[PDB]
Structure formats: structure tokens, C-alpha cells
């Protein structure tokens, strides 16, 4: 076993960096640290919204945060109160006048992080794991998605012994570079430990 991260494998080709900025050796670490802080804050805050991705950019002491969300309605709210206070909070974190942007993902069934998050939520709601995985895979496959696969880690239904569940459908060629495989991991914290939900979505070629 011991497969490698399908994103880190395809960073150069068919995938793009989540962070897009340049810095010399002098200031690389500080920028990365504040970047991590921003990512952590936004992960904590915008959970319910259906976050999928956080993008960070820098031009000249400027930050352009972009957040991919299934339901931007949750993010904005009434008269953009929430987004405004969120911008205020982010700017208070780092004195660089961040320019927050919000994008809606088309067909949130085609986002591996979202699928993993949903299945993790279902697990935390004490759903049957096998049925949940089957339904998730079918749901993804109905929305185009030339291939899908979902894995749940272990410690199923409070059983003493842990076991992997696994379910795939279609083509998931993890070995080919021009595969455009979307990957998503979610951790489900349950009364009887932790479960790891992985999702691969094979969405076209090249």
C-alpha cells in the first residue's frame, strides 16, 4: 500500500497551488505562517457554509483571499454584514487590508472535499457507513464525474476492531498524470474515536 497524495503528485500539471505568492528567503517563513493563520481562521469560521477551498495571493503588501463555498448565502447574509465583519477580523489578524472574495462551486457534488465532509457528517450522525458510501458514490457519478471512490478508515459503528470499508465506481486511474483527480479528506470525531473519510473524483482527462 502507502499511496501518495494525489494532489502533491500533480502539482506541476493538471493542478494549481492553493497559495500563489513569491517571497525571498528573508520573508518566506513569516508570510507562510500568516497564511497558515488565515487558513485556520477561515476553516474554523466558514464550516457551515460549505467551504471547499481557500486561495491566497500577494502583490505588494496586499492579500487577495478567495473562498470556494457551496452556499455563499450563508457567507454573506443580510446586507453583507457577515462578510464585512469577517473582512474586519482578517484585517485585524494581519495589517494588510485583505480583499476577501467568495465564489460558488457549480454542482457541489463534483467537489471531493465537500463529499468527504458530508460523509463525515453522516458518520457523526451515526448513519450506516456502507449505505452512506454507496449513496455518496452514486450521487457523485450521477453528476458527470467519469469516476468516483470513497474510503472510510476504521472503527466502524463502535466495534472494538477497526476495518476499512471502501467503495468505487468507474475509472479512478491514480497512476496517470493527465487524470485531473480531485481529492478530499475529512476527519469525523465520534464518541468512539476518529474516522478518516477520503474521496477521489475522476473528472475528465488532461
Amino acid at each position: 500500500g502507502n499511496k501518495i497524495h494525489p494532489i502533491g503528485f500533480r502539482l506541476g500539471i493538471t493542478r494549481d497551488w492553493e497559495s500563489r505568492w513569491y517571497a525571498g528567503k528573508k520573508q518566506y517563513r513569516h508570510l507562510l505562517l500568516e497564511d497558515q493563520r488565515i487558513r485556520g481562521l477561515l476553516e474554523k469560521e466558514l464550516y457551515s457554509a460549505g467551504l471547499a477551498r481557500v486561495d491566497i495571493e500577494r502583490a505588494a503588501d496586499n492579500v487577495a483571499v478567495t473562498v470556494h463555498v457551496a452556499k455563499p448565502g450563508v457567507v454573506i447574509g443580510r446586507g453583507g454584514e457577515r462578510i464585512r465583519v469577517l473582512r474586519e477580523e482578517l484585517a485585524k489578524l494581519t495589517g494588510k487590508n485583505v480583499a476577501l472574495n467568495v465564489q460558488e462551486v457549480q454542482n457541489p457534488n463534483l467537489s471531493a472535499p465537500l463529499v468527504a465532509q458530508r460523509v463525515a457528517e453522516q458518520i457523526e450522525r451515526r448513519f450506516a457507513v456502507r449505505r452512506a458510501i454507496k449513496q455518496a458514490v452514486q450521487r457523485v457519478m450521477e453528476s458527470g464525474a467519469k469516476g468516483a471512490k470513497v474510503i472510510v478508515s476504521g472503527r466502524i459503528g463502535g466495534a472494538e476492531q477497526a476495518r476499512t470499508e471502501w467503495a468505487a465506481q468507474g475509472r479512478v486511474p491514480l497512476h496517470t498524470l493527465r487524470a485531473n483527480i480531485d481529492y478530499g479528506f475529512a476527519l469525523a470525531r465520534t464518541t468512539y474515536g476518529v474516522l478518516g473519510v477520503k474521496a477521489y473524483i475522476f473528472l475528465g482527462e488532461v
Binding site: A70, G73, V74, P108, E121, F127
Partner: protein, 261 residues
């Protein structure tokens, strides 16, 4: 099995991207999914703690859904409407009611004089003609009077027994009630009017006169009064009562209360 029946129910309820709807007893949310897909902001009154996770998971990808942990009977729905549907034009009600609390629910909803556009519900055929009938229909009664007074109602859909996953015991009929702007007949003494209606149908075999005289505490006292009133109003008590209507009942009620109330 419920695959297309729900779509037909929603179609008959005639919801659009601007109409608001009220859901009672959502369970999983079979109707709720279709309602969210077709209609504007929805609302639910689930009370079952066990099915709450399943409903939450079902309605996770929807943003126009509100869930309330209140019983319909106990909760004053006026505030519910004034709070939730603050922009909507027409507020309808769609639900599948659980047998027992089906008549109480309808009665409570109607007796509170909501600004609801109407109601579309799925209940059993048994009590379906009992709330949409005519003179001499063998299903005429107090329930029919109440429903056909408060609103305008007619049975729409007949879902047969052989549709559900676990085979039930009774055929079902989806009924649509278009709410009425003003009550069909004007009664000053509405309460005793209702008691009169229930008195004329305490026993459906006896004649109307005997029904009326034998069902009032003052029935013994005002035997002559009852007889004269029924005689003058051109609708005598010699009939059964199932052959009367809203109009005759209104006239008789006026006769009783203008003179003895």
C-alpha cells in the same frame, strides 16, 4: 414507494419560486426535497428526536429550509408566519398527517384564522368524503360542516393502498382546501351553532326534531320552542338532518339565537 406521487401533490398545491409552504411531520423529508426544489423558503415542525439527524442530512444542501422543534398544536403559528414568511405572498400548507392527529391539526389550523392561501394534505380516504360531501351523501356530518364552512374544499387525488413500501390498511386521498375570504353564512352564536350541528348528527337514524330536542340540556325546556322554530323556518325537524345544508342550518341557527340568546 413515493417517487412521482410527491411531485403530483406539489403540482396540485401549485407552488412556485415565490410561494411559502408549511410542512408538518417531515420525517425523512420526501416532500420537503421537492418543495425546496420548486418553492421558496419552507418551514418544518418536526417533533421526533430520532429522525432529526436524518432530516438534517437530507436538507443539508438546501438554504431555504427552517426547522422548528415545536408541536403544531401547542405552537401559535401566527408568530411563526409573521417571523418566517416576512416577504412571501402566499403561504400554503403541505403535509402527511399521522392518522390520529389529523382532524385536530386541521381544526386547530382553521380555528386560528391564519392568512394561509390554502391547504393541501394527504390523509386516508376514510375521512375524505367525510370532509367533502353534499346533502344525502351518507358521509355528511359535523366535520363536513366545519371544513365546508371555514374554507372551500374538494378531494383531488386518490392514492390507492398499493403504493406504499409497507402495505397500509387504508386507501388515501390527497385533499386541497382553498381557504375562503369570508365565512359562508353569518352566525352570531357560532359556538352553539357548532353544538347544534353536532346535535343534529349525534345519531344519524333519528329524525331532526328528536335529535335537536334530545341533545340540549334545555332541550326538555324548549321542546315547543324548538318545534315552532323548525316549523317557521320552512325546514322542518321531520327530516333526518343529512338532507339539510349550510343555508338551512344558518336559518335555523338564526331562528334559535335571535329568540333565545
Amino acid at each position: 414507494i413515493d417517487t412521482n406521487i410527491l411531485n403530483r401533490i406539489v403540482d396540485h398545491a401549485e407552488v412556485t419560486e415565490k410561494t411559502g409552504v408549511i410542512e408538518i411531520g417531515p420525517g425523512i423529508g420526501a416532500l420537503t426535497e421537492q418543495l425546496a426544489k420548486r418553492a421558496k423558503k419552507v418551514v418544518a415542525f418536526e417533533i421526533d428526536q430520532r429522525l432529526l439527524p436524518i432530516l438534517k442530512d437530507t436538507l443539508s444542501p438546501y438554504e431555504n429550509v427552517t426547522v422548528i422543534h415545536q408541536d403544531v398544536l401547542k405552537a401559535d403559528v401566527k408568530s411563526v408566519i409573521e417571523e418566517q414568511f416576512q416577504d412571501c405572498d402566499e403561504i400554503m400548507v403541505v403535509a402527511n398527517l399521522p392518522y390520529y392527529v389529523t382532524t385536530p391539526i386541521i381544526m386547530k389550523l382553521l380555528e386560528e384564522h391564519l392568512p394561509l392561501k390554502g391547504i393541501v394534505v394527504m390523509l386516508q380516504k376514510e375521512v375524505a368524503e367525510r370532509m367533502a360531501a353534499d346533502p344525502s351523501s351518507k358521509e355528511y356530518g359535523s366535520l363536513s360542516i366545519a371544513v365546508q364552512f371555514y374554507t372551500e374544499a374538494k378531494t383531488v387525488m386518490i392514492v390507492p393502498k398499493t403504493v406504499f413500501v409497507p402495505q397500509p390498511n387504508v386507501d388515501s386521498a390527497v385533499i386541497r382546501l382553498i381557504l375562503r375570504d369570508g365565512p359562508a353564512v353569518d352566525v352570531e352564536n357560532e359556538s352553539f351553532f357548532f353544538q347544534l350541528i353536532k346535535a343534529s348528527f349525534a345519531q344519524r337514524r333519528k329524525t331532526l326534531l328528536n335529535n335537536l330536542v334530545n341533545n340540549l340540556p334545555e332541550g326538555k325546556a324548549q321542546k315547543s320552542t324548538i318545534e315552532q322554530v323548525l316549523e317557521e323556518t320552512n325546514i322542518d325537524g321531520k327530516r333526518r338532518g343529512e338532507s339539510l345544508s349550510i343555508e338551512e342550518f344558518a336559518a335555523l341557527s338564526n331562528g334559535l339565537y335571535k329568540a333565545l340568546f
